[PDB]
Nucleic acid binder design. Structure first.
Lengths: 65, 158, 263, 206
RNA sequence: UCGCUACUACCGAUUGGAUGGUUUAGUGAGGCCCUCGGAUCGGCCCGCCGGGGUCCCUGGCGGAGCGCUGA
RNA sequence: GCUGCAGUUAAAAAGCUCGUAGUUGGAUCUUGUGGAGGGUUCCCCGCCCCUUGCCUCUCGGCGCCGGCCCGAAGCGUUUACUUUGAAAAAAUUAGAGUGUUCAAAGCAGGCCCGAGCCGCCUGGAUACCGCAGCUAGGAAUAAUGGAAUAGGACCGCGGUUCUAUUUUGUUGG
RNA sequence: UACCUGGUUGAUCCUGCCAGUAGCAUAUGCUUGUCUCAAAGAUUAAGCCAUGCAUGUCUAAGUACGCACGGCCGGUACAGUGAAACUGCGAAUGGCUCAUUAAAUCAGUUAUGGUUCCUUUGGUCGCUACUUGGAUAACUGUGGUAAUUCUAGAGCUAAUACAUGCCGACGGCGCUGACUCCCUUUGUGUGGGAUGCGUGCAUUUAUCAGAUCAAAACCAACCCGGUCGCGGCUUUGGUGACUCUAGAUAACCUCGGGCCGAUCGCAGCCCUCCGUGGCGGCGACGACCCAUUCGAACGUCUGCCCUAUCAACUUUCGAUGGUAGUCGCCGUGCCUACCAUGGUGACCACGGGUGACGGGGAAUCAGGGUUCGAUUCCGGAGAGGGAGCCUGAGAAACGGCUACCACAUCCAAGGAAGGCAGCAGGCGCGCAAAUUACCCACUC
């Protein structure tokens, strides 16, 4: 049936491709410990908003001044 | 020419009438029939053979009961075994976008060709316009014939 | 199946220029059959409820209309989904105010208040000319009005002025180069300029070129051109912004500089 | 029931097509009128949009034009003599557009004789003098004989019609659609049309 | 090659079995169209009575022809 | 595997040659000085030889004391290509504004005395929308075409046949 | 974020595949505190369905003798609220599902100069009459069957239902032409003129006219400025294009079977005027014809998944085309008679397959791609399977009807009734999908 609802939503983070990379594990824990966070998802949110900002600036730098 | 009533019913143009009064002509005579013909528009020109002729054809653009509207197209004359109709070929290139390359294709049209064009041949170029449906498979009618942009009929002196 | 005509309209299918919200409902008002096309009108309920805000619900609109307060082209209309459109006048004699429907430069109907002596006439574009029995000449306008015995100089695409108390012709403007016009369809909807060239094709569509007050140039199909003044001067008062269509960078800079919207 | 659709039949290539939907009402057809000669019997049908159509089953009379003389009158229909489409239609006497028919000459003869002040259909003096000579000759002050040169210098009819008038019957052609209009109505054969159909009638049986 | 234990497919007697689509010859419900049919129901023409009037209107009872004419 | 794979020995070149459709196909036919924007010569005007390549009308405004000039039109051998106009539902996607307590969302919202303001300001952008059809500039590259059984052209002549039925004062001859 | 790692050997370098790694969407296991959103019997079986609901409707203004309720008393048509019944309108939209369907549906693009159109909006609405006819329902009264939203016989009465039909405003203008008057016995130029016939818009057929351009010279008779040979001219509208629109003539006409009002409600008026002749203010409802609006239908150009263990196919059993007609809202082999011998294909026809409804779109993605789309917006199709048809502006309708085929309920065995792929709910199926709840407050 038709209904007055809406269905727009999206995810705000992405999971890393290598699960057990030693160089990645302790770097993420040092950010959790210095800023007082709850879990890894709370770090992966901030990497995703920065990646979207840099993806837009890299497009605009192709166009003529 | 000298006879046209080859059918079981009498053949005439609508909208033309012959007076049965003041009929005297003496030792000679003149045409009992005036001729109906019209302008098509769109910058086309009516053939001399339609105005000076004596044929009957109701589907003719110049001397019959059709209206030229919508698309104007062209193609190459390729077969003509039917009577007052011909087949023409249209060739084109189709783009396939996964590759960056083209593909050759064709289609055929059956079209109505009146008298007033009488020297057409296979490999001539023809221009056509839309009509109302004229038969089961026919929707287009010949407006102009040419052999420009190509080799002669017989030798170069033609 | 479809065994006859339809009588509903879904809210995501409704015309974009009405600016209906997404979440109150499934349906929108289907405009009543009438003088203007379904895509090109404004239903009276959307004007009273959503634009002027005199009513909070469709029932508060119904009990404004049934008291006989609302006039369109000088006639009282009780129908809440009546299709009002371009150049029409709405009068509300109880509050003492008058309006005319004209496009905003972003392609939507503005509210535009007018003085009561300007509420006495409207401008009409000619659609057809023909001769009836006994040789009597007839005229047809863009809003379905039929007139007998027009002036024999009035031709196709011209603009005529009529008085609303009697419905008879008073004066007219010829379609020719140098006259002022407004654009009533396509992407250039709601722009104003002078006619500068007409380019014609036998079969298919003619194209008109138009020039702005700031010297910009734009074009459209001849069916989208409405003439509004002989030479440089209009026969009607015009809304804020006067059809000039400034770009998004100019609009940003005035919004920062003027500090409007309570900055 | 009966229907007039395009989708029941094959395409240009010779290939079949499968049905797209059930039969719709706007694709309808109905049986033929098969109009006979006889005293008036007409029936009416309701058609798409709520309009009415008239179907003639029997007709005895029609309206016909003698276009050469600008004369038209209501006239009795006698018989059918030629049909270009099918011989069973003349064997069973059915009336349709462009059928060839025989009609009563009388109302044209009466118009001509009173308009031109001359006889037309007459054989010998026994069918001229004993009655109705007072249609031809009367007192006419300054309009007696010479002023009728406006008539008499253009009165001569074609030899092919003067041979028909003496038999009391003219050939005519049906121009209306009797199964659609309820009327049988047309024009008198003349000139090269009359020569064409007289040759076709004679060449079939005579 | 021969032999033991699992598992998958082939050939085939059996005039095998179930379901579905094409199609020859014969039959054919029900609607619609056409040519007929005519149960039954009215009006207009001939008495007497009554209301109005210079024997007719017109209500009612009633019988012969049930004419003529409509559904 | 188009960008972008492989076939001596790991899987894989028909035993050999001809040949119609399909795909692909050699070279060639008009340039440098002067001025603007910009440089220290090349992209827009006008020129060695042609610059819209021609042309001369007529219904129709301009410039000036009738005649001669300058904007339409016949149109530039025909197409692909490329650049520009027009015309194509909304929602979704991209994207601008905006402290839903933040966010996913939504289309809102913001000023001021107290209530005597009988209120005021402001949004609901914009882009994209293959192919096919329509439209106006460019002319390299790739198709396509003209006189060899000579035809283009001159305010050039001539025989003969058809013929509109204008200009004459009209209806008829 | 444009990426790789384990496994053939005694050890080495390759080929190559298996296994690992990350997302997405269906089922399933273990586990669970707060708060804002919200998909949900598509996959198998378009399989079968107990019970309840899902479409009705009245204003000042079509018909009020219901004692049904009621007033200060009375019908001056007749008060006032008003059940029932007749009449009008709607029920062809909405909602559900995805079986069929490969140039079909569908998308972009164009066309009706080849058609139809309830309603809205604007034109148009003057070739017994101070008001006609009979007959039914509600109601009253008497019944039949095991049984249904089954209906029969008898007594009453209405209209905006059904059927008739004037008055007013004929005074049209063309054609006939007894007679009569004037220049010239006729002819030929005149002006009168007794008397007949037809004379609005629609309908069927036939005929007529539609004006414009270049240059002179003779002749009959004259427009006209003038008199017994020269100057000067005139007449619906429109398209790229009509056998268009408007006009003139001769007939037709549908009748029982085209229009031109025998209708309803508020405030009262002005007078050779005392309640009369009318003229008139506001409407309501209705109907023939144009133009609109909402559409519908038919046609143009270009665009499609796999298959040759499908290479030739179609063709009076209409295949391609011509001439005349029938039928239809209209173009057309749509169908019939006669005639011709055509039409499509290696640039893949014709045939077969599809766990195939098409599109806007969705997941994944360096650049290029691969896979998916039953599903809230738009288009199509269908209500167990096939077929036929009534009513209406619109249906080949299934919350309409008739029959065959498959299921199946009640019975007094004579008969009668039926269609959840609407909302809840049930059975069957299967790995697989929620309550027989409340309300018209919001949106329409």
């Amino acid at each position: 049936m038709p209904v007055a609802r809406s269905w727009v939503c999206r995810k705000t983070y992405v999971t890393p491709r290598r699960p057990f990379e030693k160089s990645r594990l302790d770097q993420e824990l040092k950010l959790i410990g210095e800023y007082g966070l709850r879990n890894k998802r709370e770090v992966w949110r901030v990497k995703f908003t920065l990646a979207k900002i840099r993806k837009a600036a890299r497009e605009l730098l192709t166009l003529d001044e | 020419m000298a006879d046209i009533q080859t059918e079981r019913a009498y053949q005439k143009q609508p909208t033309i009438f012959q007076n049965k009064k003041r009929v005297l002509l003496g030792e000679t005579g003149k045409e009992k029939l005036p001729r109906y013909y019209k302008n098509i528009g769109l910058g086309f020109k009516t053939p001399k053979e339609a105005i000076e002729g004596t044929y009957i054809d109701k589907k003719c653009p110049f001397t019959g009961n059709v209206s030229i509207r919508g698309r104007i197209l062209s193609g190459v004359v390729t077969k003509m075994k039917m009577q007052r109709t011909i087949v023409i070929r249209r060739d084109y290139l189709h783009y396939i976008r996964k590759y960056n390359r083209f593909e050759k294709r064709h289609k055929n049209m059956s079209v109505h060709l009146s008298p007033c064009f009488r020297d057409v041949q296979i490999g001539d170029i023809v221009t056509v316009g839309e009509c109302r449906p004229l038969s089961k498979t026919v929707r287009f009618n010949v407006l102009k014939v040419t052999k420009a942009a190509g080799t002669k009929k017989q030798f170069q002196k033609f | 199946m479809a065994r006859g005509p339809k009588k509903h309209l879904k809210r995501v299918a409704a015309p974009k220029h009405w600016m209906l919200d997404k979440l109150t409902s499934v349906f929108a008002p289907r405009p009543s059959t009438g003088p203007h096309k379904l895509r090109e009108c404004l239903p009276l309920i959307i004007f009273l409820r959503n634009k002027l805000k005199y009513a909070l619900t469709g029932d508060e609109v119904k009990k404004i209309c049934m008291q006989r307060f609302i006039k369109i082209d000088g006639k009282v209309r009780a129908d809440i989904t009546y299709p009002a459109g371009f150049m029409d006048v709405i009068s509300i004699d109880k509050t003492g105010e008058n309006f005319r429907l004209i496009y905003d430069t972003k392609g939507r109907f503005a509210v535009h208040r007018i003085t009561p002596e300007e509420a006495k006439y409207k401008l009409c574009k000619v659609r057809k000319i023909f001769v009836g029995t006994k040789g009597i000449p007839h005229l047809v306008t863009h809003d379905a009005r039929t007139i007998r015995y027009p002036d024999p100089l009035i031709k196709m695409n011209d603009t005529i002025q009529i008085d609303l108390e009697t419905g008879k012709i008073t004066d007219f403007i010829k379609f020719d180069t140098g006259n002022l016009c407004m654009v009533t369809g396509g992407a250039n909807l709601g722009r104003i300029g002078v006619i500068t060239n007409r380019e014609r094709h036998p079969g298919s569509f003619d194209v008109v070129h138009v020039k702005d007050a700031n010297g910009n140039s734009f074009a459209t199909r001849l069916s989208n051109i409405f003439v509004i003044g002989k030479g440089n001067k209009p026969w009607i008062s015009l809304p804020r912004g006067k059809g000039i269509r400034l770009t998004i960078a100019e609009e940003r800079d005035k919004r920062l500089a003027a500090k409007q919207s309570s900055g | 029931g009966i229907s007039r659709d395009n989708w029941h039949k094959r395409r240009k290539t010779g290939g079949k097509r499968k049905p797209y939907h059930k039969k719709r009402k706007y694709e309808l057809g109905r049986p033929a009128a098969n109009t006979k000669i006889g005293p008036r019997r007409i029936h009416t049908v309701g058609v798409r949009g709520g309009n009415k159509k008239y179907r003639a089953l029997r007709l005895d009379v029609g309206n016909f034009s003698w276009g050469s003389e600008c004369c038209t009158r209501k006239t009795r229909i006698i018989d059918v003599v030629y049909n270009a489409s099918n011989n069973e239609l003349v064997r069973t006497k059915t009336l349709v557009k462009n059928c060839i028919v025989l009609i009563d000459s009388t109302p044209y003869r009466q118009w001509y004789e009173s308009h031109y002040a001359l006889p037309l259909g007459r054989k010998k003096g026994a069918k001229l003098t004993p009655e109705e000579e007072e249609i031809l000759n009367k007192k006419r002050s300054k309009k007696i004989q010479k002023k009728y040169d406006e008539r008499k210098k253009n009165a001569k009819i074609s030899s092919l019609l003067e041979e028909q008038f003496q038999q009391g019957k003219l050939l005519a052609c049906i121009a209306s659609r009797p199964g659609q209009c309820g009327r049988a109505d047309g024009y008198v054969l003349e000139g090269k049309e009359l020569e064409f159909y007289l040759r076709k009638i004679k060449a079939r049986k005579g």
